[PDB]
Design a protein around this nucleic acid. Sequence first.
RNA 1: GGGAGUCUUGUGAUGAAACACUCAUGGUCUGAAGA
RNA 2: UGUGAUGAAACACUCAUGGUCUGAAGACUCCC
RNA 3: CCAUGAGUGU
RNA 4: CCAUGAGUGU
Lengths: 375, 375, 122, 122, 227, 227
Amino acid sequence: KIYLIEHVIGAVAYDENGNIVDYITNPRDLGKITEELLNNEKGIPFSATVELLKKVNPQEVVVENEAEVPKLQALGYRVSYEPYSKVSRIFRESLPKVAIDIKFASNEEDYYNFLHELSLEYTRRKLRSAAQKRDLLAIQAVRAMDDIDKTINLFSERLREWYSIHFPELDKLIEDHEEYATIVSRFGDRGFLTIDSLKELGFNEQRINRILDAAKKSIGADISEDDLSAMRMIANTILDLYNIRRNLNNYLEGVMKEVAPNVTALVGPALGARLLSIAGSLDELAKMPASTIQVLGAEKALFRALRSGGRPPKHGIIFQYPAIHTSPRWQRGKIARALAAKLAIAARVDAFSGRFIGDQLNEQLKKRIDEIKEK
Amino acid sequence: KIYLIEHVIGAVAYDENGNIVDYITNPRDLGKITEELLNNEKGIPFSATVELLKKVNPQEVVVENEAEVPKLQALGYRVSYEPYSKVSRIFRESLPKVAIDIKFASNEEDYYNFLHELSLEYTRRKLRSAAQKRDLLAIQAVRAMDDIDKTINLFSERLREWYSIHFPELDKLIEDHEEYATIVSRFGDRGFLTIDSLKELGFNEQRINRILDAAKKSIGADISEDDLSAMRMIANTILDLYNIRRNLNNYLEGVMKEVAPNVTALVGPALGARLLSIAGSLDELAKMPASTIQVLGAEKALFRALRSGGRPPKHGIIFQYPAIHTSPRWQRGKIARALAAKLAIAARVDAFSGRFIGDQLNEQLKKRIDEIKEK
Amino acid sequence: ASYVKFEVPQDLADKVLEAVRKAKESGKIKKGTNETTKAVERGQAKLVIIAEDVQPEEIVAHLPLLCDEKKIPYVYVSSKKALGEACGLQVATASAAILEPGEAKDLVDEIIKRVNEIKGKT
Amino acid sequence: ASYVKFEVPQDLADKVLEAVRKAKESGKIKKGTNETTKAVERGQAKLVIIAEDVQPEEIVAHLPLLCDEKKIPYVYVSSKKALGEACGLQVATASAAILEPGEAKDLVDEIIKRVNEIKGKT
Amino acid sequence: ITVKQTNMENIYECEFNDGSFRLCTRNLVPNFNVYGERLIKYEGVEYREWNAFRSKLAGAILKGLKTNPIRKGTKVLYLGAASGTTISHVSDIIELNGKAYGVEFSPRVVRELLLVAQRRPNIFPLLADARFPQSYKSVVENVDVLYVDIAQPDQTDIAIYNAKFFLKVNGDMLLVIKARSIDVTKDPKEIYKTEVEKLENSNFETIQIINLDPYDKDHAIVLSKYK
Amino acid sequence: ITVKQTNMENIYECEFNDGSFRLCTRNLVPNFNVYGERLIKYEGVEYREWNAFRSKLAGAILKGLKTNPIRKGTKVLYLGAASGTTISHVSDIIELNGKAYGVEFSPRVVRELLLVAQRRPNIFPLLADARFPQSYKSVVENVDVLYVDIAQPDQTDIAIYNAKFFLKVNGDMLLVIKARSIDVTKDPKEIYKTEVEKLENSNFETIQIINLDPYDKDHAIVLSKYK
RNA sequence: GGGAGUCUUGUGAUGAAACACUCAUGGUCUGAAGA
RNA sequence: UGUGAUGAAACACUCAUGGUCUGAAGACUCCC
RNA sequence: CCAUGAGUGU
RNA sequence: CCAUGAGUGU
Ligand SMILES: Nc1ncnc2c1ncn2[C@@H]1O[C@H](CSCC[C@H](N)C(=O)O)[C@@H](O)[C@H]1O
Ligand SMILES: Nc1ncnc2c1ncn2[C@@H]1O[C@H](CSCC[C@H](N)C(=O)O)[C@@H](O)[C@H]1O
C-alpha cells in the first residue's frame, strides 16, 4: 500500500509509516505546474505522478483527491482516497525541508521565491477564467439599464419643474416623458410651436390645437434664449438616454438568449438579467430554491418578516412580471409561487447546459395561471 | 365721520350705524377692476373711491387698509384705518344683496358668474408675477446640476465595474472619472491604446507607459465589439454630462451675480444657488437668522438634536465652503458661524435691493477666519 | 433711513429705552438682530425695538416684514449705541425684543398703543 | 443519467427507501426538491436521496454540487414514484432528505458508510 | 352596488360589489375627476368617490363628526386650498347655490387649483397669504363656515384673524390642527389642548374635537361656533 | 511623537502630536501603504498605522488579546484574506521568515489582493474555496496559526475542516465568529456560545474569547489550541 | 346530512408586507464672552 | 466681539460576502 | 429626519 | 434589512 502525495514539489510516494519510498520531482517551470494544478482540479493526474506510478509498481494506491481516483483506475491501478490522512500531513509537516531533499530547489530562499510566483501566476490564471464568464456582461448591462431608467425619471421630473416656468400648461397635457422631452428640445420658446413641426411627431391634430391653445393662452413667464437653452441641455440628454436604453435592451436580449435562454423564455431578458444580478451568477440562481427566487429583491421586507414572524413578501423583483402586477391582489401570491417554481427549473436547465425547453415551461405556467384566474 | 369700503363692487361710504351714505359703482369690466385690485395692494385708492370722497365731504374718514392712509392724507383728507371694523363686516353681510342694490349687476345669477371669472383672472395674473421672478431659474438650474453631479458619479462607478471585466488594472490607475471614461470612449478594446492619443489627454509620458504595459499584461477577458460598444455608450454619456455641467455652471454664475451678487461674492454661484434652493427664494433666505442659514441642508442632523437633546450639526450645505471642510474639526464651528453671519447680511442687502457690498464682507470674513486659525 | 416706516418723537423714543431696561431686571428680553428675528418667528416678542442708525440699512430691513406677518408691534430708537447700552451691553445693538415686560407692562402697553395712534389706527 | 455520480445497487437502494419510511414515523424528513435544497443550504440534512428518472434531469443536478459544499452525503434510488410513495405521498418526488433519523439511525449509518466504500473512501 | 343618502346633505355612502363602504359626493361636473377618484353611476346619477386618506374632512366624517356645517348652498371661506382635492368635494356639497373662496399662497400648487376652479363655478381661487385678509378682502363676502387647513406655526391665530373678518356670528369654523407643523418636539396631544384654548378665549364655542388618525397622523380637527 | 514596542512581537504604539494612542506594525515595504493608513517614521524606521476598526486582529488586541500566536517567523493559514487589509499587517509581523497563505474565493476582491501580494513575498494568494481544502492542498505546507475570518453560515465547520488538514498539532486558531452572517434572526450571544462548543467537541482548547464591539458589531473572536 | 368517484398537485397545493424616485408647506442649534 | 463670542453629529452614492418565506392541499362530479 | 397635499420610473 | 471587507461625488 502506497500513499501518494501531489504537490508543487513534484509527485511523492509514501509507505503507511510516512517514509519516502520514491519521488519524481517536477520541472522548475511556472508554465507547466500552473497548468497541471488547473488540470488536477478536474481529476487529471500529474504527469510526474504517472511516471511515479510506473516506477513503483503498487498494488494499492490511495490519493488525496477523490476526483483523481477514477482517472487512475482507468490507468490500470486499484485506487481509493483518504481526505485528511496522516501521511498527507507528514509531507506538509516536512515541506519546508523535503523541497531541498528531492532537489526542487537548492535552498529554502528560492523555493519560496518560486512558490510565491507560482501562486501569483496560478491565481492570475484563475482571475482570468472568472472574467471570461458570459453572464457577467449580462449583469452589468441590466445594472446600467436600471441606472438609465432611474436617471431618465430624475431628469424628466427636473425638466418638467424647470420648463414649466415658461410653459406650465404643457406639463399636464403631455403624459409621456420622452414626448415632453422632444418638445422642449426642438422648440424652446412656446411661441415657436407650429402645426407642421408638431404633426411630424404623430400628434393627432386635436391635441396639437390643445397644445397650441395652451401655449397661446399660457400664464407662463416670458424668458430669454439663454434661460431656455439651459433647460434644453437636459431635454436633449433625456432623449439621448432613451435611445441608449433601447440600444442596451437590444444588446441585453442578445446576450441573455445566449447565456440563459429558458429564463429569458419565462420572464424576458431584462427581468431575467435582473435576477442574475441579484443572485450573483447564473450558477447561483440555479442552486436556489423557488422559495428564494420568489422573494429576491425584497430583502428589507423579507427579513422584516423573519425577525418578527410577520407577513413575508409575496414577490421580490418578480413583481415586474406582467401576470402579477396587473392581476388583482389575491391572485398575486399564487402566480408568484407558480412562476418561481418554473424559474428555478429554468435556471437549472439553463446553467447545467440544457437546450431550450422554454415553450413547454411557458405553456405549463400559463395553464397554471389560467386556473388561478377562474375563481 | 364716514367709514369707507373698497371692493370689486365699487366704493361705498357708511356712517357708523351701517347705512350707505353714498356709493359709486365700479365698471363691470374684468380688465379695469383687476388692475385696481392689484393697485390697492400698494395703497392706491380705486378711481371710484376718489369720485366718492369728492361727492361726500367728510371731515374724518376711515378706511379698511393701512396702506391707503398716507395716499389719502396726500389727497387732502384726515384718514385712519380700522382693520376688521363693524362697518366692513356690515358691508359683507349684505354682499349677496348690495351688488344688485347699487346696481353692479342686474341679479345675483351673473354677479357670481363675473366674480368667478375675475377671481380666475386675478390669480392668473398673480400666477404670472410669481413665475417671472429671476431667482427661480437659479434654483432649478443648480438643482439640475446636482442631479447631473449625482448621475455622473453613479454611471462612472458602474462603468469602472463594467469595463474592468475586460481591463481591470485601468480602474486603479486612473483616479479621475472623466479621465477614465475618456479612455474607454476613444479606444474601446485595451489593445487599441496608442501613445499620441494619450498625450492628447494631458497624460505625462511616464504614466502613458504604465497604462500601456497594464493593457499588455492585463489578466482581463477578451470581449466582442458588441460587448465593448455597450460599455462605450455609458462612457460617452459621462462625457456629455461633464460638458453640460460646465455649461450649466456658467449659466448659473450669470444668474447668481444678477439676482444675488452679494451672496455670490461670499460663497460662489453654486453654493449660493444651493442655499436659495433650500430656502425656496431669495426673499425667504434673507428673513432667516444666521443660526438657521448655518445648518440649512442638515435637517436630519438638526431635528435629531432638537428631538433628543443631543449635539447639533456645526454646518449644513455651508460645509462645502472651502475654508470649512479643509479645516480641522474644532475650527469648523467658528468658521461656519462667521460665514452664516456674513451670509445673512449678504442675503438681506441682496433681497432689499442694496447695491453690491460683497468686497468688504469677504474682507471681514477672511479676517475672522485668519484670527481663528492663529491658535 | 428708508426702512424706517414712521416717525418717533424723542419723548416716545426715550420712554422706549426705559421700558427695555425695566424688562432686563424684572422680565425677559432678547438682544441682537438674529435673536430678535427668532423672537418674531417664534411669536415670543411683545415689542420689537429696531435702531434707526444701522449701517448698512438692509441688516434689519426684514424685521418690518416679519413683524407684520406675525402681527407683532415694533418701534424705533435713534441710537444703536444707546439701545445696546440700554440692553445691559457695553456694545451697540441693531435691534432687540422684549419677551416678558414684567415691571414694564403698563409702560409697554402705552407705547404699543401710542405707536398705533401715529400709525393711524382706530 | 448524468447527474448521477455513482452507481447504487438495488440492495442498497432498498435500504434507503426503508430508511426514509422509518424516518417519517420516528424522525423528521423533507419531501420535494425545493425543501431538500433548503435543507442542504441550511445544513440540517443528514442524508440526501435522489431519484434517477427525473425529467428534465437538470432539476436535481444541483444537489450533488450543493451536498459537497456543505459536505452532506447523498444517495440515489431508481424510481421517483417509489421515493414519493415511500414519503407518505400519493404523488412522485424527485428528491428527499432525512433531517432527523430517529428509529433509523443504525440503518442510515450503514447507508452513509456503504456509499462511502463505492465512493472509494478509506 | 347601492348608493344612499347619509345624515348629512349631499353626502352619500356606497354599498359595493364586494360589500365595502366608501364615502361619495354628487358630481357637480360629471365625467370629470379632480384627483384619481372613481366615478360611479347609480340610477343614472353620477357620484365622486371621496378618499378619506386624502381629505381630512372625509376623515373627520368617518371619525364621528357630530354635525356638518357644510351643506346645500353653504358659503365657505377655505384657507389652504392646496391642490383642490378637498375643496372639490365641498364644491359638490354646496352645489352652485353655495360659494367657496379658496385661499392658497403656494404658486406651484395654485397652478393645478386653477384647473379645478375652471370647471367649477362654485370655487373662487385666490393666490394669497391667509395672514393678510386685506388682500382678498375685496373679493369675498362673509361666510357660514371657516374651513382652515393651513400648515403654519401660528395657524390658529391666522384662523381667528380671518374669522373676525369673514365668519358670521353663530357661524362655524373647522380647524385642522397640524401638530408636527406646529411643533415637532412637543406631544401632539399637548398642542391640541393649547390650541383649543386659544379658540375658547376668542369666544369660539368648541363643539367637537376629532383625531384624524389613522387617516392622517398627528392631526386633529376642531368644530366650533363663533360668537 | 513617540513609538515604542508592546507586549507582542513587531507590534507598536504611538504617542502623537496631540496625545493619542494608535497601534502600528513595522513596514515591510517602506513608502507603500495597502489602504489609506498613515505611514510614520520614527528614528528613521517606518511603521504602518493599524486601524482596529478595519482589522479584527487589531481590535482583538485593543480589547485585551492575552497572547498573540502570530509573531516573527510564524506560518499562518489565512482563510478569507479579501482585499488584503488585515493580512498585510500580519505580513509586517511574521516578517519574511514566516509565511502567510491567503485563501479567498471572490475574484472581484482577489483582484486587489494581488496588488498587496506582489509587493510582499510573505503572502501567497490563492483564489480558492475554503470549503474545499483539497484545491489548495497542493501549494501550501502545514502552519502554526489558522486565522479564519470568512463570511459563511457553516464558517466554524469549514475552519475545523481546514484545521485537520493544515494546522500543526498544538497550533492556535483565531476564528472570527460572524453572528449576523451565521443567522440574523438569532441573538449574537447565543451564536458565540453554540459555535465555541463546536470547537470543543472537535477538541480545540478554548483559550480566550473576545467581543470586538465597538470595533466590529455583532462579532466575536475565539482563540483556541488544536490537539 | 351519509356514502361514492374525477381533475390539478412535492417538477410545489395553501397562507403571505415587491422595489425605486420628484415637487410644494411648515416644524430650522446655542447667545457673551474670546487672545 | 449682539453687524454674533462660546459650545456643538454637513449631505449624496458604488462594489464584494454571508444571513433568502411556508410545505399538502385546492377545485369538481355522481348515488339516497 | 417627522407630518400634510400633488405626482413619477421598473 | 443586518453584519463584514473595499471605494466614489458636492
Ligand atoms: N400662510 C398661508 N396662507 C395661505 N396658504 C398657506 C399658508 N401656509 C400654508 N398654506 C398652504 O396650505 C396648504 C395646506 S395642505 C392642505 C390640503 C388641502 N386642504 C386638502 O385637503 O386637499 C399648503 O398647500 C400650503 O401651501
Ligand atoms: N467560502 C469562502 N471561502 C473563502 N473566502 C470566503 C468564503 N466566503 C466568504 N469569503 C470571504 O471572506 C471575507 C470576509 S471579510 C474578512 C477580510 C479579511 N479577513 C480582513 O480583515 O482583511 C470576504 O471578503 C469574503 O469574500
